[PDB]
C-alpha cells in the first residue's frame, strides 16, 4: 500500500517523491482531475452557510434544484426528473424499486423480473464480449446474436413477468466490454417490441466518459431510467442519482439530495460545461488517446487494443491467433504490479488491462501513459 | 420563515432577520449545532489533499479507519466492526441484507422473515405507544403486553423462519414513541429465548440523542447490528453505517468516502473532547425535560413525555379520554404557528415533537418552551 501526499491533474505523488499517472481517475470518478480548488470552495461555502435542510426552510439558491436542472439539461431528451441518493450503489437499488413500484401502480404486479447480462428476481443473458466469447464469429454477427438473446429471455420468462432490462452502455468493472457495433441497434429494435422498462446504468459511462455526456448518447439509447454517480461530483464528494423519463416520473409522482454534495455536483457540472471538458475530450483528447493506445498492438503480449472516448482496454494473451491466455499465471496482476512500480495506474480485470483517465488528460500525459504501459508490458513478458 | 441566510448554534436566521430556534436539529441530525468551523475545515482539508481512494493507494492516515475505531470506542460491548454507507437509508438496506446473508452462510436459508413494529419477508407487531393504544391499562402492563406480542409472532412464524427483530430503541419519525419502562426488559427476556438477530435502528437515537451515546445504552440492549447516520456527522455531510457485533462480522467476513469520514471523525472528536454527550445527559436534558413538562397544564396538552434530548407533546380535545380533534388538522395548525413564531417543531399527527441540538443551553430551552406555549395558545384560539 503506497502512501499518497499530493494529487493534481492526472498525477499522484507518493511519500517518496515518485510521480504516478492515475489512468483510472480514482475509481472511474475524477473526471475533472485532482486539485480543482473550485470544488473544495463550493463544499466549504455550502457547509459553512447551511449544512443541511429542505422545504419550509432553505437557502436562497438551493443547489439540489439547480443540480437537477443542470443534469436534465445534458441528459437525453425526455429525462426530466432527478432523484438524488448518497451513492451509486444506493442509486441502483433505488432504480430497481422504482421499476417494480412503477408496474405495481400500472396495475401489473406480476412484472417483477429484471433481465441483466452476465458480468454486468434477476435473470441473465450473455454479455457482448467478442474477444473472450465470440470465437470465430465476425464481431457484427456475434453482436446481433448476443442482442437476440435478450428477446429469447423475454419470451422465455414471459413479457408479463418482466419488469425491466438493466445494462451499462459499456460494462466498466467487468473489463471495458465494448459491444460490437451491431449490438445496440439490435437491442433497441427488440426493446421497441416489448412493454418493459430500460434502465441505463450510467454510473461509469456518465458525465463524459465515452466522449458524450452519457453512454446513452453514444449509442442513441432512449432509456426510461439512468443511474448516475462518480463523475457527477468528480468523486470529490459522495453522491448518486436516478434520472427518470417524464412518463415514468408521472406515474411514480402520484403514489432529493444533500446540499453540500449538490453544491459540489453543480460546480463540477459547471466546470465540465464552461471549460468544454466533455467536448474537448471527444474532439481532441480521445482521438489521440485511442490512436496512440493501439500503437501497442505490435507488442507480443497484446492480443487486442480497443477503446472509444476516454475508455481503453488491452488484452494480454499467450497466442494472438487463438486469443488464448497464460491460464493460471495471473498475468493481469503481474502487469498491474509493474504498472504500479513504474508510476502508472491501470487496473487488471482478468488478463485485461483497463484505463479510464481523467477527461482533462493532455496529449503529453497520454504520451506518458502509453510509454509507461509498453514499458510494463515488456516487464511482464520478460517475467513470464 | 422561508429563506435562511445564517445558521449558528441552535438558531437559523431568515432573510428578514427573524431568529428561528431549530427544535428539530435539522432532521434529528445536527448534534453539535450549526456553524462549527472545525467540521468545515476537516472536509476542506480532506478534499484538497486526496478526495477519494481505497487500497493499493491510500493517504497517510485514512479517516475511515480512525472513525471505525472511534465509533466502536463508544459503541456497546463487542460491537467491533463498522461498515460505512452513503446514508441512513442505505444503512438500513444493508443491514437487512446482512442479516439474511448471515443466516445463509450459517446454512439456514429459511431464516428470512424480519419482524418489525407498526409505525416503525416482513411482519409487524404492535408499537409500544401507550398514549394512543394503551387505553386504560397501566403503562407498565401495556408495555409487557406489547413486548409479549414479539414472542407470539416469533412462534407464529416459526423461529426457524425468522432472521431478525429490528427496532429503534425509541421510534423517532413515528412520533417519539417512548415505550413503557417494562417494555425493553420484557423484550430482552424474549430475545434471550430465541436464536434470532437483533438490529437496533440507531439512525435517530445514536450519538447522544437519549443522553447516552446510543439508545441501546439507555435501555442496556445488546444488539447484533446497529444502523447509524445523521448525528454521526451532525448532518454536515451525508454518511451512514452499520456497526456489527464480533460474532456476526466473523461469519460475514467468511469502506466510506474519505471526506464524509473526515467530517464524522472530527464530529465524534468534538462530541467526546467537549463532553457534549455527557453534558446533554447531566445539564441540558434534565432542564429540558423539566421545562417541557410545565406545558402539561395547557388546555390543549394531553401529555408531555420525553427523555434525554427527545420531547413530545400530545394535543388532545379531551384530556381524560385522550381524544383528538378528529379531521381538524391540529398538529399542522400548531406547527404553522410554531414556524411563524420562530420555533421549529415537527408534527406527527397531533403530536408535536422536538429533538434539539445537544448543545442547547438553558436560556435556549427557556426560549423553546416560551415559544411552544405561545403557539399552543395560538392553536387553541384558532380551533
Residue numbers in the entry:
A (entry chain A): 34 to 153, 180 to 314, 324 to 452
B (entry chain B): 34 to 153, 180 to 313, 324 to 452
Provide the authors' original text about this structure.
We earlier identified a putrescine transaminase spuC gene in Pseudomonas putida with preference to aliphatic diamines other than putrescine such as cadaverine and spermidine. A basic local alignment search tool (BLAST) analysis revealed a 76% protein sequence identity to a spuC gene from Pseudomonas aeruginosa, that was previously characterized to be part of a polyamine uptake and utilization pathway converting putrescine to 4-aminobutyraldehyde. In this study, we report on the detailed characterization (structural and biochemical) of the putrescine transaminase Pp-SpuC, and its application in the transamination of a comprehensive range of ketones/aldehydes for the production of a variety of benzylamine derivatives. We recognized the important dual substrate recognition of Pp-SpuC, accepting cadaverine or isopropylamine as the equilibrium shifting amine donor, and having excellent activity against a broad range of aromatic aldehyde derivatives bearing various electron-donating and electron-withdrawing substituents, as well as different heteroatoms in the ring, with excellent conversions.
A commercially available crystallogenesis screening set was employed, obtaining crystals under a number of different conditions after overnight incubation at 20°C. The best diffracting crystals were obtained in 0.2 M MgCl2, 0.1 M Bis-Tris pH 6.5, 25% PEG3350, then cryoprotected before freezing. There are two monomers in the asymmetric unit and the enzyme forms a tight dimer with predicted surface area of about 28710 Å2, with buried surface area of 3980 Å.2 Each monomer can be divided into two major domains. The large domain comprises residues 93–313 and folds into a sandwich of α/β/α comprising a core of seven stranded β-sheets with only β10 being antiparallel. The large domain is flanked by a small domain composed of two subdomains joined by a parallel β interaction between strand β3 and β14. The N-terminal subdomain forms extensive interactions with monomer 2 of the dimer which is important for active site formation, similar to what was observed with Cv-ωTA and Pse-ωTA. Unfortunately, all our attempts to obtain the structure of the complex of Pp-SpuC with PLP bound were unsuccessful. In the case of SpuC, the catalytic residue Lys289 is located on the loop between β4 and β10. Another disordered region of Pp-SpuC are amino acid residues 154–179 and 313–324. The homologous region 154–179 forms a “roof” above the cofactor binding site in the holo structure of Cv-ωTA, indicating its importance in PLP binding. The active key amino acid residues which constitute the small binding pocket and allow accommodation of substituents less bulky than an ethyl group are identified in Pp-SpuC as Phe23, Phe89′ (from the other subunit), Tyr154 and His155 (absent in the Pp-SpuC apo structure).
